[PDB]
Amino acid sequence: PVLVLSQNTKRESGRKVQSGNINAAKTIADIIRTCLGPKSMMKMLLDPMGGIVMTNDGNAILREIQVQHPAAKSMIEISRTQDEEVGDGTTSVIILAGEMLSVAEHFLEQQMHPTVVISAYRKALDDMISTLKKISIPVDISDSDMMLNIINSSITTKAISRWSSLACNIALDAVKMVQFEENGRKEIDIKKYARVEKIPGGIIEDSCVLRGVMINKDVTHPRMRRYIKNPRIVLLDSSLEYKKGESQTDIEITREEDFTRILQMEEEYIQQLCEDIIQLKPDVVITEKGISDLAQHYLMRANITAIRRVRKTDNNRIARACGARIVSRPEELREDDVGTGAGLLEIKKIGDEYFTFITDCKDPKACTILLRGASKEILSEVERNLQDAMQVCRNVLLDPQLVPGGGASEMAVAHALTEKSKAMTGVEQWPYRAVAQALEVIPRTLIQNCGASTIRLLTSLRAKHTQENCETWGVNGETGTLVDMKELGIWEPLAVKLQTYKTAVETAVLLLRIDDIVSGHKK
Amino acid sequence: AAVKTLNPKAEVARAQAALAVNISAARGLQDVLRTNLGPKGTMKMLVSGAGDIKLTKDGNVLLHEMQIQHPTASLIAKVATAQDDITGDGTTSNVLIIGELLKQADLYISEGLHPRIITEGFEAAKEKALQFLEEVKVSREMDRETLIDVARTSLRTKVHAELADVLTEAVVDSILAIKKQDEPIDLFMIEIMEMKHKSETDTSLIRGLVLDHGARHPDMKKRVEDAYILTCNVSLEYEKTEVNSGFFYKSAEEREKLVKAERKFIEDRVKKIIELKRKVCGDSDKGFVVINQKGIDPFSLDALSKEGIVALRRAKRRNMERLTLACGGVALNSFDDLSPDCLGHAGLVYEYTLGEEKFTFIEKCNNPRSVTLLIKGPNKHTLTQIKDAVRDGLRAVKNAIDDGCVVPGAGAVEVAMAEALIKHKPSVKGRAQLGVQAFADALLIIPKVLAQNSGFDLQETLVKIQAEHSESGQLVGVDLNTGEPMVAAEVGVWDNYCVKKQLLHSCTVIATNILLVDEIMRAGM
Amino acid sequence: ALHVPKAPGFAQMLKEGAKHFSGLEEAVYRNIQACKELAQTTRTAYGPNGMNKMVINHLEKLFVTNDAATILRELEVQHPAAKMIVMASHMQEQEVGDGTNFVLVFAGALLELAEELLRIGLSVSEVIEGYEIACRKAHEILPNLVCCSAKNLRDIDEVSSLLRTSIMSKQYGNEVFLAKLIAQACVSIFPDSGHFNVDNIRVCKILGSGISSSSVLHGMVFKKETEGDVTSVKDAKIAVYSCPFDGMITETKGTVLIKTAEELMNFSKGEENLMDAQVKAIADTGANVVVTGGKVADMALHYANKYNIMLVRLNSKWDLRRLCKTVGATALPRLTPPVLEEMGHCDSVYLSEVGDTQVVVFKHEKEDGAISTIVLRGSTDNLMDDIERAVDDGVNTFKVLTRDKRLVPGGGATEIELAKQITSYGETCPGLEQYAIKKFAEAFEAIPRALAENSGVKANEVISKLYAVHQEGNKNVGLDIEAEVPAVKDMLEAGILDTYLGKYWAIKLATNAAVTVLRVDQIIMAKPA
Ligand SMILES: Nc1ncnc2c1ncn2[C@@H]1O[C@H](COP(=O)(O)OP(=O)(O)O)[C@@H](O)[C@H]1O
Ligand SMILES: Nc1ncnc2c1ncn2[C@@H]1O[C@H](COP(=O)(O)OP(=O)(O)O)[C@@H](O)[C@H]1O
Ligand SMILES: Nc1ncnc2c1ncn2[C@@H]1O[C@H](COP(=O)(O)OP(=O)(O)O)[C@@H](O)[C@H]1O
Ligand SMILES: [Mg+2]
Ligand SMILES: [Mg+2]
Ligand SMILES: [Mg+2]
Numbered sequence A: 001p002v003l004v005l006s007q008n009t010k011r012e013s014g015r016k017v018q019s020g021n022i023n024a025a026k027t028i029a030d031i032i033r034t035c036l037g038p039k040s041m042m043k044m045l046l047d048p049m050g051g052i053v054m055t056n057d058g059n060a061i062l063r064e065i066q067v068q069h070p071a072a073k074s075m076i077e078i079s080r081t082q083d084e085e086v087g088d089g090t091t092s093v094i095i096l097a098g099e100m101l102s103v104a105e106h107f108l109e110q111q112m113h114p115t116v117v118i119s120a121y122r123k124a125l126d127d128m129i130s131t132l133k134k135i136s137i138p139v140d141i142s143d144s145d146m147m148l149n150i151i152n153s154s155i156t157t158k159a160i161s162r163w164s165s166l167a168c169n170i171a172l173d174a175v176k177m178v179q180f181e182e183n184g185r186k187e188i189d190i191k192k193y194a195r196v197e198k199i200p201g202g203i204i205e206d207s208c209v210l211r212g213v214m215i216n217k218d219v220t221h222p223r224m225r226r227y228i229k230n231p232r233i234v235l236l237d238s239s240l241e242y243k244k245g246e247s248q249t250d251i252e253i254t255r256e257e258d259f260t261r262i263l264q265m266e267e268e269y270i271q272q273l274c275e276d277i278i279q280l281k282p283d284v285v286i287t288e289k290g291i292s293d294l295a296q297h298y299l300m301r302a303n304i305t306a307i308r309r310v311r312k313t314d315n316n317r318i319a320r321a322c323g324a325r326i327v328s329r330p331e332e333l334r335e336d337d338v339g340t341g342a343g344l345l346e347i348k349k350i351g352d353e354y355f356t357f358i359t360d361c362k363d364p365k366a367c368t369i370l371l372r373g374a375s376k377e378i379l380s381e382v383e384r385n386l387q388d389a390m391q392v393c394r395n396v397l398l399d400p401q402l403v404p405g406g407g408a409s410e411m412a413v414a415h416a417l418t419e420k421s422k423a424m425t426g427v428e429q430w431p432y433r434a435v436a437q438a439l440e441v442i443p444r445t446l447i448q449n450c451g452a453s454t455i456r457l458l459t460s461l462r463a464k465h466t467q468e469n470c471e472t473w474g475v476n477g478e479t480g481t482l483v484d485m486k487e488l489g490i491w492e493p494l495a496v497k498l499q500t501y502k503t504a505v506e507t508a509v510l511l512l513r514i515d516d517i518v519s520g521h522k523k
Numbered sequence B: 001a002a003v004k005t006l007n008p009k010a011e012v013a014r015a016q017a018a019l020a021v022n023i024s025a026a027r028g029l030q031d032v033l034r035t036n037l038g039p040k041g042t043m044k045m046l047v048s049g050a051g052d053i054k055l056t057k058d059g060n061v062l063l064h065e066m067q068i069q070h071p072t073a074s075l076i077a078k079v080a081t082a083q084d085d086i087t088g089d090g091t092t093s094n095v096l097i098i099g100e101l102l103k104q105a106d107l108y109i110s111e112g113l114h115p116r117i118i119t120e121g122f123e124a125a126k127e128k129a130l131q132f133l134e135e136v137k138v139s140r141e142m143d144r145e146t147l148i149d150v151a152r153t154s155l156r157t158k159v160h161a162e163l164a165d166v167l168t169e170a171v172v173d174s175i176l177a178i179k180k181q182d183e184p185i186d187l188f189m190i191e192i193m194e195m196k197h198k199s200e201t202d203t204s205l206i207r208g209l210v211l212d213h214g215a216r217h218p219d220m221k222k223r224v225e226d227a228y229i230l231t232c233n234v235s236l237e238y239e240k241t242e243v244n245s246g247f248f249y250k251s252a253e254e255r256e257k258l259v260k261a262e263r264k265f266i267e268d269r270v271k272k273i274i275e276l277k278r279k280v281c282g283d284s285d286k287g288f289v290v291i292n293q294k295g296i297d298p299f300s301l302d303a304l305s306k307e308g309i310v311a312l313r314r315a316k317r318r319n320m321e322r323l324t325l326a327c328g329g330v331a332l333n334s335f336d337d338l339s340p341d342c343l344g345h346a347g348l349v350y351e352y353t354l355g356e357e358k359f360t361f362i363e364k365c366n367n368p369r370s371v372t373l374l375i376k377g378p379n380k381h382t383l384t385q386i387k388d389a390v391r392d393g394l395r396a397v398k399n400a401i402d403d404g405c406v407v408p409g410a411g412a413v414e415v416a417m418a419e420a421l422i423k424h425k426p427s428v429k430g431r432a433q434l435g436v437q438a439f440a441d442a443l444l445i446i447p448k449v450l451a452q453n454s455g456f457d458l459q460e461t462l463v464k465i466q467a468e469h470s471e472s473g474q475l476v477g478v479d480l481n482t483g484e485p486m487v488a489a490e491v492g493v494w495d496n497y498c499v500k501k502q503l504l505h506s507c508t509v510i511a512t513n514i515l516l517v518d519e520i521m522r523a524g525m
Numbered sequence C: 001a002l003h004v005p006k007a008p009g010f011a012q013m014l015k016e017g018a019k020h021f022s023g024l025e026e027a028v029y030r031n032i033q034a035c036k037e038l039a040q041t042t043r044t045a046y047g048p049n050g051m052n053k054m055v056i057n058h059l060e061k062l063f064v065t066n067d068a069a070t071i072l073r074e075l076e077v078q079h080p081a082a083k084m085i086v087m088a089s090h091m092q093e094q095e096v097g098d099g100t101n102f103v104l105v106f107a108g109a110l111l112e113l114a115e116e117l118l119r120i121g122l123s124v125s126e127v128i129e130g131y132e133i134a135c136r137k138a139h140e141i142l143p144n145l146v147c148c149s150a151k152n153l154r155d156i157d158e159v160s161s162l163l164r165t166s167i168m169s170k171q172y173g174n175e176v177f178l179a180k181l182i183a184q185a186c187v188s189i190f191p192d193s194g195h196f197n198v199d200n201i202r203v204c205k206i207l208g209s210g211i212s213s214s215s216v217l218h219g220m221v222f223k224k225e226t227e228g229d230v231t232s233v234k235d236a237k238i239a240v241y242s243c244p245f246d247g248m249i250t251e252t253k254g255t256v257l258i259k260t261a262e263e264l265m266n267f268s269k270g271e272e273n274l275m276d277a278q279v280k281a282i283a284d285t286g287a288n289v290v291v292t293g294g295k296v297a298d299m300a301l302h303y304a305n306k307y308n309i310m311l312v313r314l315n316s317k318w319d320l321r322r323l324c325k326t327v328g329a330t331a332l333p334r335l336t337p338p339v340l341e342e343m344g345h346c347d348s349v350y351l352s353e354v355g356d357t358q359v360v361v362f363k364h365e366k367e368d369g370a371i372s373t374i375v376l377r378g379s380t381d382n383l384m385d386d387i388e389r390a391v392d393d394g395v396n397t398f399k400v401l402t403r404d405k406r407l408v409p410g411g412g413a414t415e416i417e418l419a420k421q422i423t424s425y426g427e428t429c430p431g432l433e434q435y436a437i438k439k440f441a442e443a444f445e446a447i448p449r450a451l452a453e454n455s456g457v458k459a460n461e462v463i464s465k466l467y468a469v470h471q472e473g474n475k476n477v478g479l480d481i482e483a484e485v486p487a488v489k490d491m492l493e494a495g496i497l498d499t500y501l502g503k504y505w506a507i508k509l510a511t512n513a514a515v516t517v518l519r520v521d522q523i524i525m526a527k528p529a
Helices: A015-035 A058-064 A070-085 A092-109 A114-135 A144-155 A159-178 A257-278 A293-301 A312-322 A376-398 A408-421 A429-438 A441-450 A454-464 A494-513 B002-006 B015-036 B059-065 B071-087 B091-109 B115-136 B144-158 B161-178 B252-261 B264-280 B298-306 B317-326 B380-402 B412-427 B432-443 B445-454 B458-472 B497-515 C023-043 C068-074 C080-095 C100-120 C124-145 C157-163 C176-188 C261-284 C298-306 C317-327 C381-403 C413-428 C433-444 C446-455 C459-472 C500-519
Strands: A042-046 A052-055 A179-181 A186-188 A194-200 A208-210 A233-236 A284-287 A305-307 A345-350 A353-357 A367-373 A402-404 A473-475 A482-484 A491-493 B011-013 B043-047 B053-056 B190-195 B204-206 B209-211 B227-232 B247-249 B287-292 B309-312 B344-346 B348-354 B357-363 B371-376 B405-408 B476-478 B485-487 B517-522 C019-022 C053-056 C062-065 C201-207 C215-217 C219-222 C239-241 C254-256 C289-292 C310-313 C348-354 C357-363 C372-378 C406-409 C477-479 C488-490 C497-499 C520-525
Touching: A015 A058, A015 A070, A015 A092, A015 A441, A015 A494, A015 B002, A042 A058, A052 A058, A052 A376, A052 B071, A058 A070, A058 A092, A070 A092, A070 A494, A092 A114, A092 A429, A092 A441, A092 A494, A114 A402, A114 A408, A114 A429, A114 A494, A144 A159, A144 A376, A144 A491, A159 A179, A159 A194, A159 A208, A159 A367, A159 A376, A186 A376, A194 A312, A194 A376, A194 B071, A233 A312, A257 A293, A257 B252, A257 B264, A293 A305, A312 A367, A367 A376, A376 A491, A376 A494, A376 B071, A376 B497, A402 A408, A402 A494, A408 A429, A408 A441, A408 A454, A408 A473, A441 A454, A441 A473, A454 A473, A454 A482, A491 A494, B011 B015, B015 B059, B015 B071, B015 B091, B015 B445, B015 B497, B015 B517, B043 B059, B043 C080, B053 B059, B053 B380, B053 C080, B059 B071, B059 B091, B071 B091, B071 B497, B091 B115, B091 B432, B091 B445, B091 B497, B115 B405, B115 B412, B115 B432, B115 B497, B144 B161, B144 B380, B161 B190, B161 B204, B161 B371, B161 B380, B190 B209, B190 B317, B190 B380, B209 B317, B209 B371, B227 B264, B227 B317, B227 B348, B247 B252, B252 C254, B252 C261, B264 B287, B264 B298, B264 B309, B298 B309, B317 B344, B371 B380, B380 B497, B380 C080, B405 B412, B405 B497, B412 B432, B412 B445, B412 B458, B412 B476, B432 B445, B445 B458, B445 B476, B458 B476, B458 B485, B497 B517, C019 C023, C023 C068, C023 C080, C023 C100, C023 C500, C023 C520, C053 C068, C062 C068, C062 C381, C068 C080, C068 C100, C080 C100, C080 C500, C080 C520, C100 C124, C100 C433, C100 C446, C100 C500, C124 C406, C124 C413, C124 C433, C124 C500, C157 C176, C157 C381, C176 C201, C176 C215, C176 C372, C176 C381, C201 C219, C201 C357, C201 C381, C215 C219, C219 C317, C239 C317, C261 C298, C317 C357, C372 C381, C381 C497, C381 C500, C406 C413, C406 C500, C413 C433, C413 C446, C413 C459, C413 C477, C433 C446, C446 C459, C446 C477, C459 C477, C459 C488, C497 C500, C500 C520
Parallel strands: A042 B517, A194 A367, A233 A284, A284 A305, B043 C520, B190 B371, B227 B287, B247 C254, B287 B309, C201 C372, C219 C372, C239 C289, C289 C310
Antiparallel strands: A042 A052, A179 A186, A208 A367, A345 A353, A402 A491, A473 A482, B011 B517, B043 B053, B204 B371, B209 B357, B227 B344, B348 B357, B476 B485, C019 C520, C053 C062, C215 C372, C219 C357, C348 C357, C406 C497, C477 C488
């Protein structure tokens, strides 16, 4: 056999490849098309680990499904991108990208070149950005009511919508506490310092955000207190045990007293560490590494409560919450490194497990959202929805501009692009106007998932958006009627919708540039 | 379909198919667990792949032991597991109410009603039912008699009636002993030890502790009357140095001196114990029992026996606290400055051998805030069954104390809540009245199944009970011996307010989410 | 239309190889059938005319016995209800030591009669109610059926007459010899306190001669040889060490660090001089016998031979402890000479050859001690194991008599009296409980029925004779196995007696097992791993 490329190297090319990519993308779109809006339905995904994921989140769904077509791979990747960047719009992006590729299929069948289509798409994207920024409105982020409405307009499309007020307040409190500035750098890190702990049982209405943190831990010794009302807290990265040296420290004994002297020396070392700790007069000591029983003895003699092996992330949150500074050498321990600011340390039994609360903090720059509910799956969905809520709150606090929902923004932008296209005289006017009408898919899908007549409602809406001050008009995903968003209250973050449009248009551009698939070749 | 065009080996259940799948699995679980409900329920036998036998009437155990591979079944098993982890009771009723909500909702969904509308009705009915539950709950001074009625209502469902009459007093006394006024009850402070020698009605409450081990030196006494208990966490065996050491000698005499010296460190702790013993027991009148969470080598065991100390080694990290709460000493990780105030007292300590195992009883403590329930029985499966039952009963009494309220049982609260929901229905806007009706007819599955298990006609019994509750307004339920209505609060059939609330909440939530599932999908390949 | 599909629900969600049985037919009756089959497998071994069985287990080991619990253990019982009945039988073995076959027979009978009652139309609940009330009545009755009591357990003739019955069902041909041996041993190790430990009766099985050459030994026997040159001692001064007979070394790594030719030249001489000093201190305490639980060093053995000490090495720690109990010594963890109290004594310690086997004997001459050994001779290892089981039965009977000295008549006399009295109770009890009470009574008839069938005579005539005699008033009358035709005689006057506690526990456990099997209604077996 005289081949040039290895067998298993299969090469497709041309309009078959183009149509295949577009069909794979629009299939990814049809998978989650119904998961958009307030009247969506849940999907039960089965993990390879025997798990279950009951969700409405586009990125959760697409991340749990597996594909082999590279266009579908790219669509799943852009859903991941939207989730990582803004944490919302994970299904709006998929649907818009699918519709853009769908409308590009026309021009590709009609002998237009993909580069022409792409240049038109990029023109349209810039003009979309312009139109969104013109129709956006500002926000007074000090207005907790405005912020709660922003968060409700984002979680109404999720399961927690029944506990909307609770979840909104939880997310707002968590983000406002995680807001932190040091050396002129503002930081809302709701991934390291807003923690969600799901404890099955109880009821969701008792879920709360703590003014402090919570870990699943107990005292090292039951003689230690489990309730302290003004704890001075010390955090350590070092083991309070006697460990070996880094070198070959081998000893050689010939005298009798030397063995006992060595063991007593170990004990004295632990005593000296514990005294270096006691000198700061703490109430609680929390370690990422072990704590020997002799160290426990000395701390208890000092009336200190110890928690043995905490995670680095939990320790960092305890630091931010109680105002402490993690240390690694109790000899280097300072009052500035001691943690004052926690208002109560409690260690209580939730079910048959012991949980440590460091709550009642003042100015805690970290938090723990304690979720309670029927099951790990329900609580996983509540946690994902709360991630959405907190990420939306964060996007707003960073860029306080808002845009109207219910497809109002899509219709306003489509109208503006159609109006700008009348000055266009080249051949790109057609793909340009096509992406403009391809933005209409969001209200179309909303109407479909509400169960109303897309033709009639979308026609009335496209007509409403030809009037002057009607860029706020959209549709209810709950009744199937056109309303003013100024009256309904569904306002999305400009950052979210910008990222959505950009990701959609660029995904379309990528899949349009793609041709001539090749496969088989092994790295 | 769409997913199958991208992942060809993908399994998918669509809008009609996913609802059918989920509701079918829920009703299958309901059909299996219907028979567990009530004291007249039937015990199932469960045989592992190894051949091990489990006799159970408990919904959670039955769920986890059945041989099932269904996604909806996994969802419902997890909700039941949460019910069990938080309340200790309500798993069977949980599964039954879930299945009945799904069935009563399918009744209207098959005629084209939307599951969204059914779930809206579910939310309205949940609100009204929680209100009615808080209204009918009986806030009662938790006396021994009330707690006995509660523990009986649980143990009579889980085991036979005479064994339940034993376990009732056992559980109630144990909890009433380890409980401090206005201090959450730590059930860890009730040890649970199983012995496999006598009848199941020999299960008792030892007002002290029972360790599953004894002394390892034969010359050590097997019975001690007035005992000083030393609870320690200090190694009394040979400890090697952390840093690598090694011994170097030039003569057998030096080797002998080093052999005598290498143990001085632990000999010193043995001497500290022995000196405390001599100072507190100037003679052999009283006794001295060392209980070590860590090891004790034979040399130390000999040294303590020679001085008349009974040393147990490798106790449990929970027994440290249990011993300091029963006896009344201090658990030590060091003998630096040990004093007689570090010791506890037990008016009796002795040893019990059972075949190849040994037990150590520590009894006649003054006011032990930690106790043990000794589960005696002739078979491993009898012991396991009684362990499960006493877990349920302990949780029940603990919950009755926590919630100073207690709710009538025998389907009384369900009957009354169904009537209240049906009287509330007109205030509900739209076709969510149908979701309300479905919620009510689902609540009615508890009295229905109780009648079905006592051997009565569900419809006739339920009509009698509902008629009595409408004519009198008294909270009436099923009499499992006559099929007639009876006042559960008057006959002493009590349920946990926490259990009923958790049922309402979690069942409504999981049923809503299942009804709103529109696609089951396995596409991880 | 050529396939029946699994019904929606549990039938479809069930795993591949899992099974689900529900209802009287699939679960209750199949469980009763399994327990009945079990009782039938062990019925022909009940009583003195009971026959032995040759069970080969999965390891190709051979058991020749008519001991029910042994047969059950070596069988691969796989049906769960039968497993439950076997658990009851093993609990009887643990609590009492004898009566396992009673437990099996009675449980199987109760379950067969329960199936019949369910077929006539009673509910499992009513059957269980009646069975429980009838077990309570049987327990109320048995104390009145107690005929004799031991009256002395320090004697050797009375104890033999008492143990003969338990060691007759097993080893019927030769029971006077075995009851004599076991009585001698039990009363040797019986202390002035009422507590009796069965592990203090040791059994040494040595091939050779036969069961009539077996003997009791006030002391201990170990199938060992001596490590040194001394083989006999007549006034033993035993010193026992849990440590080896070697120089103590460090638990931390020890190294001989030599730096001079003088140290190198002197180290080994110093080691042996140390060993000589240690062993000479031991010998000068008067010890003529040393027993080490660990190994022996060549130099230490050399010096023990030099100072005329008999060295014995017992690998086992239970053996070391029992030797300490035997001789009155204390196991020292150090090689330090023993104090006058830490030392043990034996009227003789010697090496002998019983048959092909070499043994070391620590023999007291006095007719007492803490431990006694029964040296079982026999022409077959299987025979000797069966005789050891019979010895275990006799010893457990002695312990049951130390706990409760009351005795009931055997050969089915107590069972027949129980059946009669419980039938008379059921005839007065109204309601559907009377059927179950009467069947619980009729179940007792299974015991004399099994005895008669194995004796080789007609059980119906035997049972009719027994009922007639117990109606005329004789409660101590049971069947005579020494009669080719159906016969009956005074069990008391014959000396065939059972233990009140044995019957109590057997009835209780059999009733509990039957009632649990009945309480089962659904079975969900998993795929056999
Ligand atoms: N009450 C409502 N009525 C109509 N449209 C709504 C309503 N609430 C949210 N939306 C719209 O639904 C879309 C968000 O749906 P969602 O399922 O959260 O998808 P994603 O966040 O992944 O884009 C946005 O276009 C939003 O404006
Ligand atoms: N003696 C009784 N008479 C009538 N009903 C009872 C009696 N005892 C318990 N019940 C009821 O039977 C129901 C089911 O018991 P069980 O199956 O143990 O509870 P769960 O459903 O929590 O597992 C409970 O609601 C209880 O109120
Ligand atoms: N000489 C005898 N005559 C009649 N019955 C006897 C005699 N010896 C023993 N038995 C009876 O044999 C039965 C016990 O036999 P065995 O096979 O050991 O059963 P178990 O295992 O229940 O002890 C008892 O009923 C006992 O009375
Ligand atoms: Mg969203
Ligand atoms: Mg219960
Ligand atoms: Mg016998």
